[PDB]
Write an enzyme that holds these catalytic residues in place. Structure first.
Site, PDB file in Angstrom:
ATOM      1  N   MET A  10      50.451  31.220 -13.446  1.00 26.76           N
ATOM      2  CA  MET A  10      50.652  32.276 -12.460  1.00 26.76           C
ATOM      3  C   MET A  10      51.808  31.922 -11.540  1.00 26.76           C
ATOM      4  SD  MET A  10      46.766  33.497 -11.510  1.00 26.76           S
ATOM      5  CE  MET A  10      47.352  34.959 -10.665  1.00 26.76           C
ATOM      6  N   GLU A  11      52.989  32.432 -11.897  1.00 26.45           N
ATOM      7  CA  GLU A  11      54.207  32.277 -11.107  1.00 26.45           C
ATOM      8  C   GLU A  11      53.965  32.626  -9.653  1.00 26.45           C
ATOM      9  OE1 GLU A  11      57.206  35.269 -11.611  1.00 26.45           O
ATOM     10  OE2 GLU A  11      58.780  34.063 -10.648  1.00 26.45           O
ATOM     11  N   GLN A  70      55.134  25.505 -19.276  1.00 23.99           N
ATOM     12  CA  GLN A  70      55.508  26.758 -19.947  1.00 23.99           C
ATOM     13  C   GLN A  70      57.002  27.035 -19.815  1.00 23.99           C
ATOM     14  OE1 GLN A  70      54.778  30.930 -18.404  1.00 23.99           O
ATOM     15  NE2 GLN A  70      53.342  30.955 -20.135  1.00 23.99           N
ATOM     16  N   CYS A 100      54.764  38.156 -19.738  1.00 23.00           N
ATOM     17  CA  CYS A 100      55.205  38.555 -18.384  1.00 23.00           C
ATOM     18  C   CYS A 100      56.337  39.538 -18.423  1.00 23.00           C
ATOM     19  CB  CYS A 100      55.798  37.369 -17.636  1.00 23.00           C
ATOM     20  SG  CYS A 100      54.578  36.321 -16.878  1.00 23.00           S
ATOM     21  N   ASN A 202      42.215  36.506 -23.171  1.00 23.70           N
ATOM     22  CA  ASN A 202      42.608  36.597 -21.777  1.00 23.70           C
ATOM     23  C   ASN A 202      42.592  38.038 -21.276  1.00 23.70           C
ATOM     24  OD1 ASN A 202      45.675  36.860 -20.154  1.00 23.70           O
ATOM     25  ND2 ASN A 202      44.028  35.691 -19.185  1.00 23.70           N
ATOM     26  N   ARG A 227      43.682  35.674 -12.451  1.00 20.23           N
ATOM     27  CA  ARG A 227      43.395  36.178 -11.084  1.00 20.23           C
ATOM     28  C   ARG A 227      41.963  35.834 -10.624  1.00 20.23           C
ATOM     29  NH1 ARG A 227      43.856  42.129 -12.208  1.00 20.23           N
ATOM     30  NH2 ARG A 227      43.255  41.254 -14.247  1.00 20.23           N
TER      31      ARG A 227
END
Ligand SMILES: Cc1cc2nc3c(=O)[nH]c(=O)nc-3n(C[C@H](O)[C@H](O)[C@H](O)COP(=O)(O)O)c2cc1C
Length: 317
Positions: A10-11, A70, A100, A202, A227
């Site tokens: 999660m950037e 990643q 993404c 996911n 999240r």
């Protein structure tokens, strides 16, 4: 019986600090770093150390959970060079982002853009597999497609045919975004039935029952949570063991620890932004987080928010 749970990349959320905090109170099998953006150069070693400080601890968080670097990008030669560097520096394998939404740099796409031509996923993943010693894993993370799921099997085939070790599938198309009603774990199962590598399901896993449903429908014994892992800070143990969600006072304790962790390269606003952000997630689950967010949203500097969070007496809660 056996179940694997991965912490999602999660950037701008799940950096090394939050990975440290979360892994200490969880049983995640693996965490994925924020992406390293690859264009047409070998990135210097410091970029990898910034994104993955765990490389200097044998690719593990301080509590011992494995972390994997990643990459995000398109050009095979440069994904390969950077994959080799990640593993030379200690990464336990390497992951490739194909889910993404991402800006194209010059001609160098990345992320969900690659879903528009599955061959781009094949070429990038294959170059990475060839560059990384054969005993170490190469994983790829995908969505079901761009504006439909029509190419979902081509996408999955590209990953397998490239020689990848495992495939994470976010069960939505790019255009479906994060819309809850569009999650399709069945599609993930259809992909799994076709393949001979593990598929990690996911999307929209929030609690014990949702994980049970996901596994039952997809036939996957491995899941990835993004999240939900911020909304419920012990979510791995909720999912694996059907333990209760972390009580609020322990959540506050976690936020307090976060305010005391230093961030490398911090100009001064890191904790303000990140405490507000984490609370913005927590309010979905904890009534108390909505109230705390109202109190701290008006604070514009890290020392003020640190004092405010640290002032809370968790034995009174
Ligand atoms: C703020 C945010 C940042 C993300 N950054 C990345 C990223 O760096 N790399 C990646 O492959 N996926 C990224 N994702 C996608 C997540 O890894 C995950 O696939 C998605 O959130 C769906 O899972 P969830 O329903 O459990 O959240 C990001 C998601 C969010 C919400």
């Amino acid at each position: 019986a056996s179940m694997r749970v991965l912490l999602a990349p999660m950037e701008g959320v799940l950096d090394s600090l939050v990975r440290e905090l979360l892994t200490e109170v969880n049983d995640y099998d693996l965490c994925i770093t924020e992406f390293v953006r690859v264009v047409d150069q070998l990135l210097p070693v410091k970029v990898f150390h910034r994104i993955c400080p765990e490389l200097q601890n044998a690719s593990r968080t301080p509590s011992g959970t494995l972390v994997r670097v990643q990459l995000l990008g398109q050009f095979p030669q440069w994904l390969a060079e950077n994959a080799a560097r990640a593993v030379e520096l200690g990464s336990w394998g390497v992951d490739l982002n194909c889910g993404c939404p991402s800006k194209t740099v010059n001609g160098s796409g990345g992320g969900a853009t690659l879903l528009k031509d599955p061959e781009l996923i094949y070429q990038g993943a294959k170059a990475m597999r060839e560059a990384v010693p054969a005993h170490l894993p190469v994983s790829v993370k995908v969505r079901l497609g761009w504006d439909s799921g029509e190419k979902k099997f081509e996408i999955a085939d590209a990953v397998q045919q490239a020689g990848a070790t495992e495939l994470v599938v976010h069960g939505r198309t790019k255009e479906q975004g994060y819309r809850a009603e569009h999650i399709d774990w069945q599609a993930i199962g259809d992909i799994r039935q076709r393949l001979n590598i593990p598929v990690i399901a996911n999307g929209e896993i929030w609690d014990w029952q949702s994980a049970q449903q996901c596994m039952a429908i997809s036939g996957c014994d491995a899941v990835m949570i993004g999240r939900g892992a911020l909304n419920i800070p012990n979510l791995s143990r909720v999912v694996k063991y059907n333990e209760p969600r972390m009580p609020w006072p322990e959540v506050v304790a976690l936020l307090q620890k976060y305010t005391r962790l230093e961030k490398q390269g911090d100009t001064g606003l890191y904790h303000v932004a990140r405490i507000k952000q984490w609370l913005s997630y927590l309010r979905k689950e904890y009534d108390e987080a909505t109230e705390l967010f109202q109190h701290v949203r008006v604070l514009n500097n890290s020392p003020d928010i640190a004092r405010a969070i640290q002032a809370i007496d968790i034995e009174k809660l």
